[PDB]
Fold:
Amino acid sequence: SMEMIEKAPTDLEDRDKAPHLLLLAGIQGDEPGGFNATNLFLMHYSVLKGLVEVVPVLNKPSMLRNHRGLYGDMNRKFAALDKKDPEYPTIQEIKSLIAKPNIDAVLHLHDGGGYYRPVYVDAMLNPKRWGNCFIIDQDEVKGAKFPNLLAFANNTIESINAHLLHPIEEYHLKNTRTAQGDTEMQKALTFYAINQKKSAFANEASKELPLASRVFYHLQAIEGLLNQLNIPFKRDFELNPSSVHALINDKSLWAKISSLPKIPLFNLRPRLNHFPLPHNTKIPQIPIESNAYIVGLVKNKQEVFLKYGNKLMTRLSPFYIEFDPSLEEVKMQIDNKDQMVKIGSVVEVKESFYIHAMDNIRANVIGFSVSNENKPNEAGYTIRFKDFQKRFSLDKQERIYRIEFYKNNAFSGMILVKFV
Ligand SMILES: CC(=O)N[C@H](CCP(=O)(O)C[C@H](CCC[C@@H](N)C(=O)O)C(=O)O)C(=O)O
Ligand SMILES: [Zn+2]
Ligand SMILES: [Zn+2]
Ligand SMILES: [Zn+2]
Structure:
C-alpha cells in the first residue's frame, strides 16, 4: 500500500510559484535510511512555494518484511515487464506519478553497501559500491525544465559535503552513463524519469552507517536539491544526527489499529497477548493510522507484527473476534469525576477510576481481577494503580492498561487508562 502525500504551501496559488519535486524512497524494503528520511520530511518540514510530492515507501510489503524485494527488485521493473508480474500495477502508478506534467524533478533515495569511490581502493571502497554518492544517468537531459543534471548534482554534492560527520563519508558523483551500456540501470526508475524529460537523481546513504546517520545524509541531499530547485522550505528542528535520532525515536509516535485506541509506538512490551483484531479481515486490510508514514502490520506465524519501518515495535498475539460498533461511549468515573468516555479513547488517571455497569456490556480491566472467571465483569469496582498486576501493562513503564468491552461474544471496543 503506497500512497503519495503532498507537501504544499498553505495557499494553493503558491504551488505554481516554484518547481515541483517528486521524492521517492523504499523501492527496496531493507533500505531504511530512505524511507525514514521521507517519513521525517513529511512529518517535520514545510514547503512554502512549489510542491514536493512524496511517496515515502514505494515497496511497503517488502519494507514490512525487511526485504530488498519480495516480488523481485522493483527497481528493475521500469523497462520490459510482464503484465502478470505482481507489481505491474504498482509500477504503472509510479510511472504515472513520474510522468505527470507538473513534475519537474525526481529524487530517489537508497541505502547502499560500502562507500562509492570513482576508482578502486578496496572491497568496501570502489566503483561497484553504492554508499554515499549522488547519482545521475547522464550529465544532461534535453527537453527538461532543468536540463543540467551535472550542475545540480555537483552543487548538491558540495552542499552535503559541507556537513560530513567523518571524512570517509564524503559524497562523490556517480554518473552511470546508463544509455551507454548499463543494462541494469536501463531497467531502473531514474532512467525511466529521464526518458520523460524529468531531471532525475538518486541519493545513496551507506548501509555501513547507523540509521540516524543515513537519514541525516538523505535529508542533506533533499535540502541540497530543494536549494538548487529554489523550492523554499522550513523544518522545526536542527539538522544534526542527535536531533534526527530523537525524531526517529519520537515517543509521541502512535499507531491506531482499527477502531482501537492509539497505542504508543515506543516502549511497548515486546508482546501483547490476547489482542483483539477484527473477524475475517486480511491483515493488510486492517485499517491502521499513525502520525508517522511508515507504520504497518504484518503476519508472522501466529503473531501480527507492528512495524515502524524495519523496526519491530511489538508482537501482537491476536484474538480474532467480531467488532461490534454499537457501543460508542461508556460512563466512567475518573478521579471522582463522572464522565462519558468515547470507545477508543485514552484517558489519563491520577488516582482512580470506576466503570459504571451496563446492561448487556461486560468490561474486562486487563491486569485487574477479583475472582478467576474466564469471562469477567469488572464494572462496579473502584480501581487504583496499586490494584494492577503491572506485567499486564501495554508499556514497559507499567502505566498504560487496557479496558476491553464485550457485548456477548462480540468485541465492543477498548479504552486505555494511563496512570500519570
Ligand atoms: C544485493 C544488494 O544488497 N544490493 C544493494 C544495491 C544498492 P541500491 O539498490 O541502492 C543500487 C541501485 C540504485 C539505482 C540508482 C538509480 N538508477 C535509480 O533508479 O534510483 C539499485 O536500485 O539497484 C547494495 O549493494 O546495498
Ligand atoms: Zn516536528
Ligand atoms: Zn536501493
Ligand atoms: Zn553530455
